[PDB]
Structure 1
Amino acid sequence: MLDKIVIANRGEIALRILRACKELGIKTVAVHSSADRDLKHVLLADETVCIGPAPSVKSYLNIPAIISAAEITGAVAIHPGYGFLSENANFAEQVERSGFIFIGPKAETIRLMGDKVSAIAAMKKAGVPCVPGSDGPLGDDMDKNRAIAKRIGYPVIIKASGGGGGRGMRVVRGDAELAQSISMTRAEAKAAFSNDMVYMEKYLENPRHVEIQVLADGQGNAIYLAERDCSMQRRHQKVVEEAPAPGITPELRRYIGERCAKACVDIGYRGAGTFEFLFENGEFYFIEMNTRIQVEHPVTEMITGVDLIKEQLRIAAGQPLSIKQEEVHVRGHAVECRINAEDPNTFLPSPGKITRFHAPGGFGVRWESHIYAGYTVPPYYDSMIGKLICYGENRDVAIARMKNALQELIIDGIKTNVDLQIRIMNDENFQHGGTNIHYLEKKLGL
């Protein structure tokens, strides 16, 4: 087991990582900005290092400062959490070059999945179903681009190969708009990644966002831990996630899961990872892979019993997977509601001091948050201040528990999205299940 690690993150995920470290007897180093001195995990950590001022560029994205903190404390590994530098291949490379373990895959693997075109090519080769597409970057030959579009069939979508999460894409519905659409996507990509590479996919009109959790030890062992539906979202931000995905049969799960696991072996994947799919008309289509642990990991933990963070730490210590595929069993159902400090009318972050706090408790209730009474939510970071996760023996039980936990939750002094979460739990279409990626924005437009 790793002697000591730097937790290269903040907020709820840093606390989540700290708890796993403590379970495993791993010493903790909490690196933090000057605005984050009173973070719960910082107060709980074995050692603390202030790595810079409030803005993320000079703290949580400050590669030399994070590496120096590992150096000064004699840490053996760095956990990047999610966001920040977790998908930064240069950071992973610098971490290993400086002589520390990066808790994540090889830098080459991060780089491979970071490039959307190369990622899809690798996944297609491995037998993972992808969206019908260009299978390569689009060039300047518009005859060739029209032929790709015809072969695929309109509508199509132009996507940037550098891009993440849905940044800068456009739907094309005929030849008439194709040339300009390619042109425009190229330009926005140049500003975002200094990379004008674009590709084409068949545009799916009303898909669900379904992602497969994997773990791989780098020793040839790779398992899939069912799936999560993340379709409930607003402006590229997930709002509610759940596991398993409604309507997914054991057979479909096994079909897609085995293909993801085999792909992990093909690419020499190491650690936790997520294969993101679009799901429409009973069919899976790979869009991208996340090579980090994700915000929504807890729903997968509830339905499988596998502690994904502890697995990351075990794998980073060079241990083989703690379980075989045949030992992974989907049981019950879990729903996560993200709790955001945000104004309900503007959807802008709403920072400030929490004056009264009470966490929900009870059977099947899991509360993931650094917040406490008297804690000030700083203006400098993301709006998500906690995650409420409810498990039950079935989806209806999980939802009923979530409704009650949400009503029990008290966060006074700041504005939150609790009332919206309650609305969603009471939504008849959500109660039925299987709503698509466009649903919440359509609902909120009414």
Structure 2
Amino acid sequence: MLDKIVIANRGEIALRILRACKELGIKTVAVHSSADRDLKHVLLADETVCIGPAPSVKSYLNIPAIISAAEITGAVAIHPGYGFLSENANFAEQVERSGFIFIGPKAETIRLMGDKVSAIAAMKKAGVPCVPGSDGPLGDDMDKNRAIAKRIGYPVIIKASGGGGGRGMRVVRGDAELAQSISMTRAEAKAAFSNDMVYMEKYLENPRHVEIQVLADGQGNAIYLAERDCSMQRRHQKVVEEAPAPGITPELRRYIGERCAKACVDIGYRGAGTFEFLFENGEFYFIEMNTRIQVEHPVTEMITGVDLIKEQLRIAAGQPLSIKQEEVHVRGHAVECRINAEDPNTFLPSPGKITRFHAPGGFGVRWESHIYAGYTVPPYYDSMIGKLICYGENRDVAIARMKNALQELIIDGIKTNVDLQIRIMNDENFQHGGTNIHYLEKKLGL
């Protein structure tokens, strides 16, 4: 078991990682910006290192400072959490080069999944169903590009290979817009990622966003841990996630899960991972893979009983997976509401000092947050300050518990999305289940 790790993150996920470390007897090093001195996990950590000023570029994205903190404390590993450097292959490369364990896959694997074109090619080869597409980068020959779009059939979507999570993409519905749409996506990709490579896919009009959780060790074991429905979103930002996905049969789960686990074996995957799919008309279509542990990981934990962060740490230490596939069983239902410090009218981050705080409790209620009474939410980082996760024997009980929990949650002094989350729980279409990726924005528009 790893002696000491650097938690290379902040907020709720850093606290999540800290708890996992404490359970396994792993010493904690909390690296933090000067604005994050009073973070809950920082105050609970065995050792603390201030790695720079408030802006992320000089703290949480500061590669030399994070590695130096690992060096000075005698830490053996670095957990990147999600966001920041978690998908940075060069960082993972430098970490291993410096002699520390990167809690994640090999840098080569991160690089592969960050290249959406090569990732799709690897998945298609492995037998994972993908979106009908160009199967390769688009060139400058517009006669060829029109032929590809005709073969696929309009509408199509142009996507940046260096993009992801809905960054750098646009829908094309006819030949007249194809040239300009390709050029613009290319230009945006060059400006944002220093990679102008773009590809084409059949545009699915009303899919659900369904993703498969995987775990793979260094002993050759690779398992799938059911799916998550992440369709309740606004402008490429998840709002509510749930597990399992409504309407997904054990047969479908088995079908797509086995294909994801087989892909892990083929590519030599290691650690936690997420296969993102579009789900439409009872069919799965792979779009991208995430190599990090994700925001919405707790819903998977509730329905399987598997502590995913602890599995990450065990894998990194050289231990096999604590569970086999036949030991993985979907039981009950979990819903996650992301709690954001945001203005209800603009959806812009709303930082400030929390004057009164109270967390919900009870059977099946899980609260994941660093916030406390007197805590100031800084303006420099993401708006998400907490996660409320509710579990039940069925979906209806999970939703009922969420409604009760949201009503107990008090966060005064700052503006939050608690009222919005309550509106979503009370939404008849959500209560029926199976709403698509576009539902929330349509609801808010009406």
TM-score range, shorter chain: over 0.9
Counterpart-to-counterpart distance in 1, 2:406 and 2:92 = 38
State the shift of 1:33 in Å: 0.3
Counterpart-to-counterpart distance in 2, 1:272 and 1:191 = 31
State the shift of 1:179 in Å: 1.5
State the shift of 1:146 in Å: 1.6
Counterpart-to-counterpart distance in 1, 2:205 and 2:346 = 28
Counterpart-to-counterpart distance in 2, 1:63 and 1:44 = 24
Displacement over 6 Å in runs of 4+: none
Query: Where does the alignment leave 5 or more consecutive residues of structure 2 unmatched?
Result: none
| Alignment TM-score, normalising by the size of structure 2 | 0.99
Deviations 1:167-223 (A, max 9, x none): 121111122221221111111111111111000000000000000000000322100
State the shift of 1:142 in Å: 1.6
State the shift of 1:267 in Å: 0.6
Deviations 1:332-374 (A, max 9, x none): 0000000001111111111111111110000000000000111
Counterpart-to-counterpart distance in 2, 1:386 and 1:120 = 33
Deviations 1:359-413 (A, max 9, x none): 0000000000000111111111000000000000000000000000000001111
Aligned residue number for residue 269 of structure 2: 269
Deviations 1:226-258 (A, max 9, x none): 000000011111000000000100000000000
Counterpart-to-counterpart distance in 1, 2:54 and 2:196 = 32
State the shift of 1:149 in Å: 1.1
State the shift of 1:30 in Å: 0.3
Counterpart-to-counterpart distance in 1, 2:160 and 2:399 = 37
State the shift of 1:67 in Å: 0.3
Q: What SS does the aligned partner of 1:248 have? A: coil
Counterpart-to-counterpart distance in 2, 1:315 and 1:161 = 29
Counterpart-to-counterpart distance in 2, 1:121 and 1:127 = 10
RMSD: 0.6
Q: What SS does the aligned partner of 2:162 have? A: coil
Deviations 1:53-95 (A, max 9, x none): 0000000000000000000000000000000000000100000
Counterpart-to-counterpart distance in 1, 2:222 and 2:297 = 17
State the shift of 1:140 in Å: 1.4
Q: What SS does the aligned partner of 2:163 have? A: coil
Q: Which moved more, 1:302-311 or 1:142-151?
A: 142-151
Counterpart-to-counterpart distance in 2, 1:181 and 1:341 = 35
Q: What SS does the aligned partner of 1:169 have? A: strand
Q: What SS does the aligned partner of 1:176 have? A: helix
Counterpart-to-counterpart distance in 1, 2:55 and 2:236 = 23
Aligned residue number for residue 399 of structure 1: 399
Aligned residue number for residue 230 of structure 2: 230
Q: What SS does the aligned partner of 1:168 have? A: strand
Counterpart-to-counterpart distance in 2, 1:170 and 1:12 = 33
Aligned residue number for residue 68 of structure 2: 68
The size of the alignment, in residue pairs, is 446
Counterpart-to-counterpart distance in 1, 2:383 and 2:186 = 31
Deviations 1:92-125 (A, max 9, x none): 0000011100000000000000000000000000
Q: Which moved more, 1:135-144 or 1:68-77?
A: 135-144
State the shift of 1:151 in Å: 1.3
Counterpart-to-counterpart distance in 1, 2:349 and 2:175 = 41
Q: What SS does the aligned partner of 1:163 have? A: strand
Q: How does 1:59-98 map to 2 (within 5 A)?
A: 59-98=59-98
State the shift of 1:424 in Å: 0.3
Counterpart-to-counterpart distance in 2, 1:179 and 1:236 = 25
Counterpart-to-counterpart distance in 2, 1:37 and 1:182 = 45
Counterpart-to-counterpart distance in 2, 1:189 and 1:308 = 33
Aligned residue number for residue 384 of structure 2: 384
Counterpart-to-counterpart distance in 2, 1:364 and 1:32 = 32
Q: What SS does the aligned partner of 2:113 have? A: helix
Deviations 1:147-171 (A, max 9, x none): 2111111111100000021112111
Deviations 1:14-53 (A, max 9, x none): 0000000000000000000000000000000000000000
Counterpart-to-counterpart distance in 2, 1:356 and 1:304 = 34
Q: What SS does the aligned partner of 1:161 have? A: strand
Counterpart-to-counterpart distance in 1, 2:356 and 2:294 = 29
Counterpart-to-counterpart distance in 1, 2:248 and 2:148 = 31
State the shift of 1:309 in Å: 0.1
Counterpart-to-counterpart distance in 2, 1:442 and 1:96 = 46
Aligned residue number for residue 303 of structure 1: 303
Query: Where does the alignment leave 5 or more consecutive residues of structure 1 unmatched?
Result: none
Counterpart-to-counterpart distance in 2, 1:14 and 1:342 = 21
Counterpart-to-counterpart distance in 2, 1:96 and 1:353 = 39
Matched, 1:330 2:345: no
Counterpart-to-counterpart distance in 2, 1:205 and 1:245 = 19
Identity %: 100
Deviations 1:259-310 (A, max 9, x none): 0000000110000000000000110000000000000000000000000000
Counterpart-to-counterpart distance in 2, 1:373 and 1:289 = 37
Q: How does 1:149-188 map to 2 (within 5 A)?
A: 149-188=149-188
Q: What SS does the aligned partner of 1:43 have? A: helix
Matched, 1:244 2:283: no
Counterpart-to-counterpart distance in 1, 2:177 and 2:31 = 49
Counterpart-to-counterpart distance in 2, 1:196 and 1:428 = 43
Aligned residue number for residue 432 of structure 2: 432
Matched, 1:279 2:283: no
Q: What SS does the aligned partner of 1:360 have? A: coil
Counterpart-to-counterpart distance in 2, 1:180 and 1:342 = 35
Counterpart-to-counterpart distance in 2, 1:319 and 1:151 = 48
